[PDB]
Amino acid sequence: GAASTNQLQYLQKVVLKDLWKHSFSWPFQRPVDAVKLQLPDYYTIIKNPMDLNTIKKRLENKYYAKASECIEDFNTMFSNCYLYNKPGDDIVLMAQALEKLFMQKLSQMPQE
Numbered sequence: 682g683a684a685s686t687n688q689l690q691y692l693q694k695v696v697l698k699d700l701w702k703h704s705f706s707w708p709f710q711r712p713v714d715a716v717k718l719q720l721p722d723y724y725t726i727i728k729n730p731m732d733l734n735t736i737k738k739r740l741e742n743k744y745y746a747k748a749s750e751c752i753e754d755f756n757t758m759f760s761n762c763y764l765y766n767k768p769g770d771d772i773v774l775m776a777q778a779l780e781k782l783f784m785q786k787l788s789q790m791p792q793e
Contacts, residue, residue, distance in 0.1 A: 685793055688748035693740040696755070696786045701733055703782055705775040709733050709758060726765055731758040748790075755783060 682689055700706055710733045715723040724730065731754050738744075745751045762776040 682743050683746055685748035688790060688793060689740065689745060689751065691790050692748055692751045692755075693737075696783065696790070697733065697737055697740065699786055700755075700779060700783060701737075703779055705778050706733060708772055708775060709762075709779065723765060727761050729757055729761065731755075731761060733758070752787065755787075759783070 701710065712730060712732050712735065713720065713723055713727075715721065736751065736754050736758075739754070740751065759776055759780045762772060766773045
């Protein structure tokens with residue numbers, strides 16, 4: 682698009698796709714529905730919420746001027762999970778496995 686054109690493509694076609702395909706991705710695919718999940722404090726504690734669909738649509742809409750802004754959103758998805766929940770929680774173990782895959786794919790991203 683503009684800055685980091687091949688890198689934004691990689692984030693969309695490799696990183697996002699491979700995280701989505703991962704079997705643990707489903708709790709991270711859409712914004713947390715705090716009414717349906719009965720979590721009235723979720724959006725009190727998490728002020729920068731992020732999910733894979735928001736990243737997907739942002740990439741589709743060319744929202745990111747550079748790849749680092751998209752990487753920030755991926756990292757925020759994980760950090761929000763560890764902030765809201767506790768060690769040993771099922772959602773935290775799922776996030777950790779996804780984050781390990783994310784770090785592999787990010788490490789393989791070709792330079793600009």
